[PDB]
Amino acid sequence: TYHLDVVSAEQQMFSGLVEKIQVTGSEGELGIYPGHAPLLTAIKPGMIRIVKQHGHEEFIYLSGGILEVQPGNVTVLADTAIRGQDLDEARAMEAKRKAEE
Amino acid sequence: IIYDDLSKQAVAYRQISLLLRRPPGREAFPGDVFYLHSRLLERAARVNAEYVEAFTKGEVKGKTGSLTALPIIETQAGDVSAFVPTNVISITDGQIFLETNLFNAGIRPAVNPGISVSRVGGAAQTKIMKKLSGGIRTALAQYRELAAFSQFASDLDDATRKQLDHGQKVTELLKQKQYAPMSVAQQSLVLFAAERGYLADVELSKIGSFEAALLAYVDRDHAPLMQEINQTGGYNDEIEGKLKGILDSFKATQSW
Amino acid sequence: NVISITDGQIFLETNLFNAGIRPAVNPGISVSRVGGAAQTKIMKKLSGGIRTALAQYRELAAFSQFASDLDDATRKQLDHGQKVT
Amino acid sequence: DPLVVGQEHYDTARGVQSILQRYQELKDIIAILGMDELSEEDKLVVARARKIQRFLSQPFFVAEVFTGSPGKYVSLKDTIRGFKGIMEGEYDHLPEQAFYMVGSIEEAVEKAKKL
Amino acid sequence: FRDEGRDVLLFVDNIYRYTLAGTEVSALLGRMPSAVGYQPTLAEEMGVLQERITSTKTGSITSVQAVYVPADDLTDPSPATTFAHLDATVVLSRQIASLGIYPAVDPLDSTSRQLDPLVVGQEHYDTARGVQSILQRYQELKDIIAILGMDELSEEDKLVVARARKIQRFLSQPFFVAEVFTGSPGKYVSLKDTIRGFKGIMEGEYDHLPEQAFYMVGSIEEAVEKAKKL
Amino acid sequence: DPLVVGQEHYDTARGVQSILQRYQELKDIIAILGMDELSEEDKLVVARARKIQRFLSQPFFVAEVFTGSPGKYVSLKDTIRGFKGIMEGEYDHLPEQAFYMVGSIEEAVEKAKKL
Amino acid sequence: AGAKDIRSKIASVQNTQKITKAMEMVAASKMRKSQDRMAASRPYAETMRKVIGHLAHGNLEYKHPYLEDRDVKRVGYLVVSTDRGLAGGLNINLFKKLLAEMKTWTDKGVQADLAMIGSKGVSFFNSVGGNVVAQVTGMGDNPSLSELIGPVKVMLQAYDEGRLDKLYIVSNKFINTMSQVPTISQLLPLPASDDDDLKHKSWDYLYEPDPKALLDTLLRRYVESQVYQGVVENLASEQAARMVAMKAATDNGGSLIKELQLVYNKARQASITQELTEIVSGAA
């Protein structure tokens, strides 16, 4: 079984040893089985499926982020809110407009 | 015996002393004003049975007689350093100290704990009141410490939030109407409710309703126990069990 | 005694006199019993507002300075009171 | 005395007095804390207290000489309604000066309607 | 009793009442008042009382006098005159009593002008100074614990706190008069035993036995023998 | 008076008094809370008031028996120049100690060169 | 002056002292909670940095505007400040250090640039006239990363447009419970952190969709993460500074009580003496 950590900048969402998971990668859904090959990709917003070791299946919503894999250890670096260039631009303009004031 | 204003007796004695050309003293009072109030109040006491038998030439034998006194004094701006107030505080066995800011806050009667105390203490009380009142003093003292944390928020602590909640609810518990005295059973029942956690869930506005409703309930349904407590003032596990049953029944059944 | 006898009081303060406010009359504690009944009418109109404005300005100045704070109408009132002072 | 004046009058007056004492207690440490470090429970209480204090102020028929404004007359039932109105209705919709020297409750809300 | 050759104790139940009785009598006779309304003879009357209480070549009178300070003001002429005559000063604390510690003497506010090496010796002086320093440092550390918990303390700080707790426990004593309540037999502790006990506790001996072995026991030997089955 | 001593002699003295008087009113908040809670120009008032307080000091020819320092005589056309410059901040860059027991502004800047 | 009003002052100052003691206790507890929130912010940033080191110092070391070093023509600072007073000199010390370095670059002809977290810095650099292009305020004791996105996105846009050549974060450091220090650190271009390993041969990532796209998103996330870490540390530093300030205030209040009481007692004694002199000298 492999050690998985799902983390965010503010808090660590989940961790532990896990048998497999299914995650919505940038190109499509992907299942990370034990001892999987190295990987790096962006992941889409939605539910992702965990099955913890001893078979305890679970759903975690993520607002997006990055997924990485290597033989002993795997982690997901999740975003807190939906990230999009338009939303980021709205936030940036809100900062500028406040700066004029 | 209640002397309505010993201050005014000091004033009248001051006047009559000045008109009689007697030498003036501190704040114009004659030198022996302390002796005035001293020999007056010290008459109040409790005398043993041998004194009574000797005085009455044997017509009464077993009893002990007494005279208890409640003198009243008026302070100016809460100054206790004035001559007459500090004289009589040197004379008496304690003081009930009434504060105008408490009265304005709606705390009525405005008894101010920690600065108002009776030295006789426990010895005066009935067993049940002596047992139950010990917690109230410490709870109110803890309330005074944690009063500073009240207005500024208490969201940053927990056990203290529970101590504060209990202290505030007992502070809300002690107010009373002007002409409604309580028997010892009524007092002890309400105090038992407050101390043993049975008020913990009640919100402050409805604590008053809680007290009114509980007294009505026990006078309707559990009078024999009230009679026995009013007669003996005793306390027992049998009595604590009866009180627990009564409060359980009230919390289960009635609306307050 | 003389405060009890008279029709009014003009209070002159050394803390005002030392801060450059000469003549150092304290508006908050100085009073006139006759009232505007002893004024010409133009002066009556204008002066009415001044007295209240000065007292309120002093109170606001203390409050808002140690608070180190701002609100819009209070700001406007405060810098009108400073200017009339 | 609640027997003499009645419950409405008594509990209204006593509520006003309680509010003002709490205000006096907060007032000193407001100087040190501003309203920045005061809590929300304090902020509602101070709003109510400040506006209640202004609602006490009344222009007198005698004092029109000093003030220019006409003297005002307010009935007991009316002012009990008004102080209960800020006690329970809590009409913080209105500026603080709308409570000042207006007299009646209706004239208070009408002054707020004008400004 | 002094002239018979004994050493005697005289207890005065309140010296302030003696001062006030003198004031009242002086006022009744019509003499002009002084200071804060006291009699003109205040210091003389106090000196007449206090100078008789001394150690002579046949015997001595020691005196223990209850003092009330008006308005909590130590500048008032009655305290100011009385303090000219006192040698030692014992302060009783409500807070110490609440801890269960009896007698409720406060070790940091009670003082005596006999604590000098020149009259009491260097061992006793350094021991008393030591326990005072430990208890004061403990009070400051207890404030630090109140605001930030025990995690802030270093090993040296924890040693200081532990020895301070052992010292505070060791200040309690069972009286021959208190047997009615405790049921423990009363104990009279000689000065040498007290000096040895606080010397040992200060310098790290007896760190290996718990603080409750020191409480209400008596001598330090009795503390260790209490510990063995505690 | 402006007529007796001239407008400079009067304006400098009143500026000195105004600055010092403001220093007094800031002392209670400085006492309770310290200087870091002052406004950013109240800090400047405090700095200039402290410099002024120190420059009022002067070595006397009759105090050599105590201080050991040489004495100083300061004419009018020099002291009002110094205080006017301090008030206007043109000498604000020197440290406080530079103004203690110096005769004229020259001796203060010189003493600041000696730290 | 007058003993009745002096006693009123004594009561007022005593009440003030009690409340400042309470504030000290609260500040300590809040410091604890914010330094727990500080540790949780580490793992995200540090694992992100290991990935970035794997890519950036690996053989596939692309030349990215965020990763490369160029001559300074403009420079920018992201600056963190409190929303609340009573913190002592924390803000002012940080702003002084910032003013020193901002002067040093602008003497080289370099235009300065500012983005402000917290309203105290906004007011201070509006009074100074500093060049502020983005700000966010009112986060209080509950900061969130999503709020920081605005100002950092503005500064980042100016950076990859080539307008800004270097970009710092200005923040205090929570070195200890008892001590903190103001700092200025460069977050862009990416500093040459050691970050050396060769185990990447064994596990090399399969880059979906592209390596460089993933690298860009990683760098943007890293800058966002570092800004959030600085903000949380400055919040913990605020709590500790307010704690020590309230300790000092409580002690000074007690030390003022002990002087007002001497004034009061001397006035009490003098008033009694004078009144009784008038009475006795009044008779006959």
PDB file of N, CA, C and O in Angstrom, chain A residues 22-65:
ATOM      1  N   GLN A  22      -8.997   7.096  -7.474  1.00  0.00           N
ATOM      2  CA  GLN A  22      -9.342   7.565  -8.811  1.00  0.00           C
ATOM      3  C   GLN A  22      -9.444   9.084  -8.799  1.00  0.00           C
ATOM      4  O   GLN A  22     -10.160   9.653  -7.968  1.00  0.00           O
ATOM      5  N   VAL A  23      -8.721   9.734  -9.711  1.00  0.00           N
ATOM      6  CA  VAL A  23      -8.572  11.187  -9.727  1.00  0.00           C
ATOM      7  C   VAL A  23      -8.784  11.702 -11.144  1.00  0.00           C
ATOM      8  O   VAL A  23      -8.303  11.104 -12.112  1.00  0.00           O
ATOM      9  N   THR A  24      -9.491  12.828 -11.259  1.00  0.00           N
ATOM     10  CA  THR A  24      -9.771  13.469 -12.546  1.00  0.00           C
ATOM     11  C   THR A  24      -8.568  14.303 -12.988  1.00  0.00           C
ATOM     12  O   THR A  24      -8.429  15.483 -12.659  1.00  0.00           O
ATOM     13  N   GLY A  25      -7.676  13.670 -13.749  1.00  0.00           N
ATOM     14  CA  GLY A  25      -6.515  14.367 -14.262  1.00  0.00           C
ATOM     15  C   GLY A  25      -6.856  15.322 -15.390  1.00  0.00           C
ATOM     16  O   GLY A  25      -7.961  15.327 -15.935  1.00  0.00           O
ATOM     17  N   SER A  26      -5.868  16.149 -15.743  1.00  0.00           N
ATOM     18  CA  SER A  26      -6.046  17.132 -16.807  1.00  0.00           C
ATOM     19  C   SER A  26      -6.512  16.495 -18.110  1.00  0.00           C
ATOM     20  O   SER A  26      -7.248  17.121 -18.881  1.00  0.00           O
ATOM     21  N   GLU A  27      -6.099  15.255 -18.372  1.00  0.00           N
ATOM     22  CA  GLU A  27      -6.454  14.573 -19.606  1.00  0.00           C
ATOM     23  C   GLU A  27      -7.622  13.612 -19.433  1.00  0.00           C
ATOM     24  O   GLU A  27      -8.246  13.237 -20.430  1.00  0.00           O
ATOM     25  N   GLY A  28      -7.916  13.203 -18.207  1.00  0.00           N
ATOM     26  CA  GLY A  28      -8.970  12.243 -17.943  1.00  0.00           C
ATOM     27  C   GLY A  28      -8.770  11.576 -16.601  1.00  0.00           C
ATOM     28  O   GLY A  28      -7.750  11.748 -15.932  1.00  0.00           O
ATOM     29  N   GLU A  29      -9.781  10.799 -16.212  1.00  0.00           N
ATOM     30  CA  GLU A  29      -9.740  10.080 -14.943  1.00  0.00           C
ATOM     31  C   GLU A  29      -8.613   9.052 -14.951  1.00  0.00           C
ATOM     32  O   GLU A  29      -8.354   8.398 -15.965  1.00  0.00           O
ATOM     33  N   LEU A  30      -7.936   8.910 -13.814  1.00  0.00           N
ATOM     34  CA  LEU A  30      -6.814   7.988 -13.690  1.00  0.00           C
ATOM     35  C   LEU A  30      -6.823   7.310 -12.326  1.00  0.00           C
ATOM     36  O   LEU A  30      -7.040   7.968 -11.304  1.00  0.00           O
ATOM     37  N   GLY A  31      -6.598   5.997 -12.320  1.00  0.00           N
ATOM     38  CA  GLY A  31      -6.502   5.213 -11.102  1.00  0.00           C
ATOM     39  C   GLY A  31      -5.077   4.928 -10.668  1.00  0.00           C
ATOM     40  O   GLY A  31      -4.309   4.324 -11.423  1.00  0.00           O
ATOM     41  N   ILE A  32      -4.706   5.362  -9.465  1.00  0.00           N
ATOM     42  CA  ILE A  32      -3.362   5.153  -8.930  1.00  0.00           C
ATOM     43  C   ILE A  32      -3.388   3.899  -8.063  1.00  0.00           C
ATOM     44  O   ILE A  32      -3.833   3.928  -6.918  1.00  0.00           O
ATOM     45  N   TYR A  33      -2.894   2.801  -8.617  1.00  0.00           N
ATOM     46  CA  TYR A  33      -2.796   1.523  -7.926  1.00  0.00           C
ATOM     47  C   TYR A  33      -1.464   1.441  -7.178  1.00  0.00           C
ATOM     48  O   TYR A  33      -0.613   2.315  -7.326  1.00  0.00           O
ATOM     49  N   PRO A  34      -1.263   0.415  -6.339  1.00  0.00           N
ATOM     50  CA  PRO A  34      -0.056   0.375  -5.500  1.00  0.00           C
ATOM     51  C   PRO A  34       1.238   0.404  -6.302  1.00  0.00           C
ATOM     52  O   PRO A  34       1.343  -0.192  -7.375  1.00  0.00           O
ATOM     53  N   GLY A  35       2.237   1.094  -5.750  1.00  0.00           N
ATOM     54  CA  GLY A  35       3.579   1.106  -6.337  1.00  0.00           C
ATOM     55  C   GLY A  35       3.639   1.663  -7.742  1.00  0.00           C
ATOM     56  O   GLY A  35       4.435   1.201  -8.568  1.00  0.00           O
ATOM     57  N   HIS A  36       2.827   2.678  -8.019  1.00  0.00           N
ATOM     58  CA  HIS A  36       2.618   3.170  -9.372  1.00  0.00           C
ATOM     59  C   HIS A  36       3.837   3.956  -9.865  1.00  0.00           C
ATOM     60  O   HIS A  36       4.682   4.407  -9.086  1.00  0.00           O
ATOM     61  N   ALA A  37       3.931   4.099 -11.185  1.00  0.00           N
ATOM     62  CA  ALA A  37       5.051   4.793 -11.809  1.00  0.00           C
ATOM     63  C   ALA A  37       4.974   6.306 -11.554  1.00  0.00           C
ATOM     64  O   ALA A  37       3.912   6.825 -11.200  1.00  0.00           O
ATOM     65  N   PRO A  38       6.090   7.028 -11.706  1.00  0.00           N
ATOM     66  CA  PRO A  38       6.088   8.478 -11.448  1.00  0.00           C
ATOM     67  C   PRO A  38       5.116   9.239 -12.342  1.00  0.00           C
ATOM     68  O   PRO A  38       4.886   8.872 -13.496  1.00  0.00           O
ATOM     69  N   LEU A  39       4.538  10.313 -11.798  1.00  0.00           N
ATOM     70  CA  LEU A  39       3.527  11.086 -12.508  1.00  0.00           C
ATOM     71  C   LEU A  39       3.432  12.504 -11.957  1.00  0.00           C
ATOM     72  O   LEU A  39       3.699  12.750 -10.778  1.00  0.00           O
ATOM     73  N   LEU A  40       3.042  13.434 -12.831  1.00  0.00           N
ATOM     74  CA  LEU A  40       2.799  14.835 -12.490  1.00  0.00           C
ATOM     75  C   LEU A  40       1.758  15.402 -13.443  1.00  0.00           C
ATOM     76  O   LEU A  40       1.950  15.349 -14.661  1.00  0.00           O
ATOM     77  N   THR A  41       0.668  15.951 -12.905  1.00  0.00           N
ATOM     78  CA  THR A  41      -0.358  16.556 -13.748  1.00  0.00           C
ATOM     79  C   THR A  41      -1.274  17.447 -12.916  1.00  0.00           C
ATOM     80  O   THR A  41      -1.389  17.293 -11.698  1.00  0.00           O
ATOM     81  N   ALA A  42      -1.931  18.376 -13.607  1.00  0.00           N
ATOM     82  CA  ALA A  42      -3.004  19.165 -13.022  1.00  0.00           C
ATOM     83  C   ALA A  42      -4.295  18.355 -12.984  1.00  0.00           C
ATOM     84  O   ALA A  42      -4.545  17.507 -13.845  1.00  0.00           O
ATOM     85  N   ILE A  43      -5.117  18.615 -11.970  1.00  0.00           N
ATOM     86  CA  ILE A  43      -6.347  17.866 -11.744  1.00  0.00           C
ATOM     87  C   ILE A  43      -7.531  18.821 -11.667  1.00  0.00           C
ATOM     88  O   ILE A  43      -7.417  19.938 -11.149  1.00  0.00           O
ATOM     89  N   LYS A  44      -8.674  18.367 -12.201  1.00  0.00           N
ATOM     90  CA  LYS A  44      -9.878  19.162 -12.383  1.00  0.00           C
ATOM     91  C   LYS A  44     -10.741  19.192 -11.118  1.00  0.00           C
ATOM     92  O   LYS A  44     -10.652  18.299 -10.274  1.00  0.00           O
ATOM     93  N   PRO A  45     -11.573  20.225 -10.961  1.00  0.00           N
ATOM     94  CA  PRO A  45     -12.453  20.296  -9.791  1.00  0.00           C
ATOM     95  C   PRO A  45     -13.539  19.231  -9.830  1.00  0.00           C
ATOM     96  O   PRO A  45     -14.109  18.933 -10.882  1.00  0.00           O
ATOM     97  N   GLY A  46     -13.834  18.677  -8.667  1.00  0.00           N
ATOM     98  CA  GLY A  46     -14.864  17.667  -8.529  1.00  0.00           C
ATOM     99  C   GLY A  46     -14.540  16.740  -7.374  1.00  0.00           C
ATOM    100  O   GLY A  46     -13.573  16.934  -6.641  1.00  0.00           O
ATOM    101  N   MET A  47     -15.391  15.727  -7.219  1.00  0.00           N
ATOM    102  CA  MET A  47     -15.103  14.636  -6.296  1.00  0.00           C
ATOM    103  C   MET A  47     -13.975  13.759  -6.828  1.00  0.00           C
ATOM    104  O   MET A  47     -13.894  13.485  -8.028  1.00  0.00           O
ATOM    105  N   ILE A  48     -13.107  13.307  -5.927  1.00  0.00           N
ATOM    106  CA  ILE A  48     -12.157  12.242  -6.221  1.00  0.00           C
ATOM    107  C   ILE A  48     -12.403  11.102  -5.245  1.00  0.00           C
ATOM    108  O   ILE A  48     -12.809  11.316  -4.098  1.00  0.00           O
ATOM    109  N   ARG A  49     -12.163   9.880  -5.712  1.00  0.00           N
ATOM    110  CA  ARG A  49     -12.493   8.674  -4.962  1.00  0.00           C
ATOM    111  C   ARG A  49     -11.246   8.123  -4.283  1.00  0.00           C
ATOM    112  O   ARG A  49     -10.242   7.844  -4.947  1.00  0.00           O
ATOM    113  N   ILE A  50     -11.324   7.954  -2.967  1.00  0.00           N
ATOM    114  CA  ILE A  50     -10.288   7.303  -2.173  1.00  0.00           C
ATOM    115  C   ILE A  50     -10.793   5.923  -1.782  1.00  0.00           C
ATOM    116  O   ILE A  50     -11.966   5.770  -1.423  1.00  0.00           O
ATOM    117  N   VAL A  51      -9.932   4.912  -1.854  1.00  0.00           N
ATOM    118  CA  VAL A  51     -10.145   3.686  -1.087  1.00  0.00           C
ATOM    119  C   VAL A  51      -8.908   3.471  -0.219  1.00  0.00           C
ATOM    120  O   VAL A  51      -7.845   3.043  -0.685  1.00  0.00           O
ATOM    121  N   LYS A  52      -9.056   3.803   1.058  1.00  0.00           N
ATOM    122  CA  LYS A  52      -8.009   3.667   2.054  1.00  0.00           C
ATOM    123  C   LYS A  52      -7.681   2.190   2.267  1.00  0.00           C
ATOM    124  O   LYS A  52      -8.461   1.302   1.911  1.00  0.00           O
ATOM    125  N   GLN A  53      -6.502   1.922   2.829  1.00  0.00           N
ATOM    126  CA  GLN A  53      -6.123   0.534   3.058  1.00  0.00           C
ATOM    127  C   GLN A  53      -7.079  -0.114   4.055  1.00  0.00           C
ATOM    128  O   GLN A  53      -7.609   0.542   4.955  1.00  0.00           O
ATOM    129  N   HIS A  54      -7.296  -1.422   3.872  1.00  0.00           N
ATOM    130  CA  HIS A  54      -8.427  -2.173   4.421  1.00  0.00           C
ATOM    131  C   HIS A  54      -9.765  -1.751   3.815  1.00  0.00           C
ATOM    132  O   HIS A  54     -10.823  -2.000   4.407  1.00  0.00           O
ATOM    133  N   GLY A  55      -9.737  -1.118   2.638  1.00  0.00           N
ATOM    134  CA  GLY A  55     -10.891  -1.055   1.754  1.00  0.00           C
ATOM    135  C   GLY A  55     -11.928   0.014   2.025  1.00  0.00           C
ATOM    136  O   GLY A  55     -13.044  -0.098   1.512  1.00  0.00           O
ATOM    137  N   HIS A  56     -11.608   1.049   2.794  1.00  0.00           N
ATOM    138  CA  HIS A  56     -12.597   2.050   3.206  1.00  0.00           C
ATOM    139  C   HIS A  56     -12.730   3.128   2.129  1.00  0.00           C
ATOM    140  O   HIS A  56     -11.961   4.090   2.080  1.00  0.00           O
ATOM    141  N   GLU A  57     -13.729   2.967   1.259  1.00  0.00           N
ATOM    142  CA  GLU A  57     -13.933   3.888   0.145  1.00  0.00           C
ATOM    143  C   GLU A  57     -14.577   5.192   0.611  1.00  0.00           C
ATOM    144  O   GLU A  57     -15.401   5.205   1.530  1.00  0.00           O
ATOM    145  N   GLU A  58     -14.202   6.294  -0.042  1.00  0.00           N
ATOM    146  CA  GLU A  58     -14.549   7.634   0.412  1.00  0.00           C
ATOM    147  C   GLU A  58     -14.521   8.611  -0.763  1.00  0.00           C
ATOM    148  O   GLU A  58     -13.833   8.379  -1.761  1.00  0.00           O
ATOM    149  N   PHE A  59     -15.287   9.699  -0.645  1.00  0.00           N
ATOM    150  CA  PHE A  59     -15.267  10.807  -1.598  1.00  0.00           C
ATOM    151  C   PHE A  59     -14.716  12.069  -0.947  1.00  0.00           C
ATOM    152  O   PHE A  59     -15.144  12.444   0.150  1.00  0.00           O
ATOM    153  N   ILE A  60     -13.785  12.729  -1.634  1.00  0.00           N
ATOM    154  CA  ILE A  60     -13.277  14.042  -1.247  1.00  0.00           C
ATOM    155  C   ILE A  60     -13.487  15.001  -2.411  1.00  0.00           C
ATOM    156  O   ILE A  60     -13.000  14.749  -3.520  1.00  0.00           O
ATOM    157  N   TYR A  61     -14.192  16.103  -2.162  1.00  0.00           N
ATOM    158  CA  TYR A  61     -14.222  17.188  -3.133  1.00  0.00           C
ATOM    159  C   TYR A  61     -12.943  18.014  -3.072  1.00  0.00           C
ATOM    160  O   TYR A  61     -12.456  18.351  -1.988  1.00  0.00           O
ATOM    161  N   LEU A  62     -12.416  18.353  -4.246  1.00  0.00           N
ATOM    162  CA  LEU A  62     -11.287  19.260  -4.395  1.00  0.00           C
ATOM    163  C   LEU A  62     -11.640  20.331  -5.417  1.00  0.00           C
ATOM    164  O   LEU A  62     -12.268  20.038  -6.438  1.00  0.00           O
ATOM    165  N   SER A  63     -11.228  21.567  -5.145  1.00  0.00           N
ATOM    166  CA  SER A  63     -11.440  22.676  -6.069  1.00  0.00           C
ATOM    167  C   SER A  63     -10.385  22.742  -7.172  1.00  0.00           C
ATOM    168  O   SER A  63     -10.352  23.727  -7.918  1.00  0.00           O
ATOM    169  N   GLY A  64      -9.535  21.723  -7.289  1.00  0.00           N
ATOM    170  CA  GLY A  64      -8.468  21.704  -8.274  1.00  0.00           C
ATOM    171  C   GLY A  64      -7.111  21.459  -7.646  1.00  0.00           C
ATOM    172  O   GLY A  64      -7.039  21.095  -6.469  1.00  0.00           O
ATOM    173  N   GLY A  65      -6.025  21.659  -8.405  1.00  0.00           N
ATOM    174  CA  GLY A  65      -4.691  21.530  -7.860  1.00  0.00           C
ATOM    175  C   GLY A  65      -3.790  20.692  -8.747  1.00  0.00           C
ATOM    176  O   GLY A  65      -4.042  20.525  -9.944  1.00  0.00           O
TER     177      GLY A  65
END
